[PDB]
Amino acid sequence: APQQINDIVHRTITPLIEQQKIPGMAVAVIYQGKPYYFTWGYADIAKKQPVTQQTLFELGGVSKTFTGVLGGDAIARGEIKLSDPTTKYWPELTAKQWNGITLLHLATYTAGGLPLQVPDEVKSSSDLLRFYQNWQPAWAPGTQRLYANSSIGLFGALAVKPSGLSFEQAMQTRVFQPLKLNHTWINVPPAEEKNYAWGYREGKAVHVSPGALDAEAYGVKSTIEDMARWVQSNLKPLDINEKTLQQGIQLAQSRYWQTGDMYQGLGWEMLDWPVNPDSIINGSDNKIALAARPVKAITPPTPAVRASWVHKTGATGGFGSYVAFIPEKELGIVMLANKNYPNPARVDAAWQILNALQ
Ligand SMILES: CC(=O)OCC1=C(C(=O)O)N2C(=O)[C@@H](NC(=O)Cc3cccs3)[C@H]2SC1
Ligand SMILES: *CC1=C(C(=O)O)N[C@H]([C@H](NC(=O)Cc2cccs2)C(=O)O)SC1
């Protein structure tokens, strides 16, 4: 644990925890292929259980990076194509607005305004079909980006049907197991509950509630060790032995669309490095509930750029997560907290840390 890394991480995170009143936090810095872990506070305040390297945190939207890579793996296997129409995988979506919407649109939030959330009244696949059939796009496909669980969530659900596996089984067998993410879960087993941190919202202990397409959009729980391995796998996909997975990881970091200085991948989002911190820090901000932005197509998509700031923020009611890495510098960071705090503070801290290390 280089004193440099230790100091940079502690001088940045200690103040963060104090200002945001975060009960528990785990951080991992990946530098030149080696992970350095740091933990603070509590996983369960009432039971005085500390955060450890085995503590499970709710990833929120960081889960979309796993969905994007699993999709990328299915593409590499020849099971699906992003140019495929959505109806190929759900023929029952007969409403006229679905002609023209492809798996690429679903995966990149460009289908035309699918909503951020699937309504809580949706409790079955029949309800889900009704929801999508009744949805009225605001825009033509491929014209504007609107971040949405109902978009990438449907992509995840459709992408695995050719495999014959359920989304969870596909994720476990094609991504978690090959990468040795053995303490990463869509459903936390009873044996692992002792390590499942409580999230805190307004001082109350909370866990994410079950919902339609939750696994696909915001339902993964993981430890700081597994997340560091996830970041390393995305930093250096050539070291991965499973061919289609290696390719899938690379596909998720392709640049499909541009809005401002940001590029949309499958799950992952990217900016050219070096990046103005005010374009990424101020860039990530959920203080805004709906931010519709025109997108420019990258025709054809740019293959994964090593000189990139690749990242993803995530939140649930009681957790706040952030992952960012720079392939060209073999540098990455994971920050997991059991309080959902402002996105800009997460980005500012990660930038201060990675910038200091190169
Ligand atoms: C739309 C937007 O930019 O706002 C930030 C956001 C994020 C994020 O990237 O931090 N997302 C997540 O991490 C998801 N979170 C949830 O869906 C929260 C829950 C839905 C149901 C129970 S918790 C979405 S909720 C929306
Ligand atoms: C395409 C598609 C289908 C289908 O072709 O019938 N069904 C999916 C279904 N999902 C669920 O049963 C779980 C849900 C509960 C609430 C919302 S979905 C499945 O298991 O394949 S949905 C996509």
Swiss-Prot record:
<dbReference type="Pfam" id="PF00144">
    <property type="entry name" value="Beta-lactamase"/>
</dbReference>
<comment type="function">
    <text>Class C beta-lactamase which confers resistance to penicillins and cephalosporins. Has benzylpenicillin- and cephaloridine-hydrolyzing activity. Has weak cefuroxime, cefotaxime, cefoxitin and oxacillin-hydrolyzing activities.</text>
</comment>
<dbReference type="InterPro" id="IPR012338">
    <property type="entry name" value="Beta-lactam/transpept-like"/>
</dbReference>
<feature type="binding site">
    <location>
        <position position="61"/>
    </location>
    <ligand>
        <name>a beta-lactam</name>
    </ligand>
</feature>
<feature type="binding site">
    <location>
        <position position="340"/>
    </location>
    <ligand>
        <name>a beta-lactam</name>
    </ligand>
</feature>
<dbReference type="GO" id="GO:0030288">
    <property type="term" value="C:outer membrane-bounded periplasmic space"/>
</dbReference>
<dbReference type="InterPro" id="IPR050491">
    <property type="entry name" value="Bact_CellWall_Synth/Modif"/>
</dbReference>
<feature type="binding site">
    <location>
        <position position="315"/>
    </location>
    <ligand>
        <name>a beta-lactam</name>
    </ligand>
</feature>
<feature type="binding site">
    <location>
        <position position="117"/>
    </location>
    <ligand>
        <name>a beta-lactam</name>
    </ligand>
</feature>
<dbReference type="GO" id="GO:0008800">
    <property type="term" value="F:beta-lactamase activity"/>
</dbReference>
<dbReference type="GO" id="GO:0017001">
    <property type="term" value="P:antibiotic catabolic process"/>
</dbReference>
<keyword id="KW-0732">Signal</keyword>
<feature type="binding site">
    <location>
        <position position="147"/>
    </location>
    <ligand>
        <name>a beta-lactam</name>
    </ligand>
</feature>
<dbReference type="InterPro" id="IPR001466">
    <property type="entry name" value="Beta-lactam-related"/>
</dbReference>
<feature type="binding site">
    <location>
        <position position="149"/>
    </location>
    <ligand>
        <name>a beta-lactam</name>
    </ligand>
</feature>
<comment type="similarity">
    <text>Belongs to the class-C beta-lactamase family.</text>
</comment>
<keyword id="KW-0574">Periplasm</keyword>
<dbReference type="GO" id="GO:0046677">
    <property type="term" value="P:response to antibiotic"/>
</dbReference>
<dbReference type="InterPro" id="IPR001586">
    <property type="entry name" value="Beta-lactam_class-C_AS"/>
</dbReference>
<comment type="subunit">
    <text>Monomer.</text>
</comment>
<feature type="active site" description="Acyl-ester intermediate">
    <location>
        <position position="61"/>
    </location>
</feature>
<keyword id="KW-0046">Antibiotic resistance</keyword>
<keyword id="KW-0378">Hydrolase</keyword>
<protein>
    <recommendedName>
        <fullName>Beta-lactamase</fullName>
        <ecNumber>3.5.2.6</ecNumber>
    </recommendedName>
</protein>
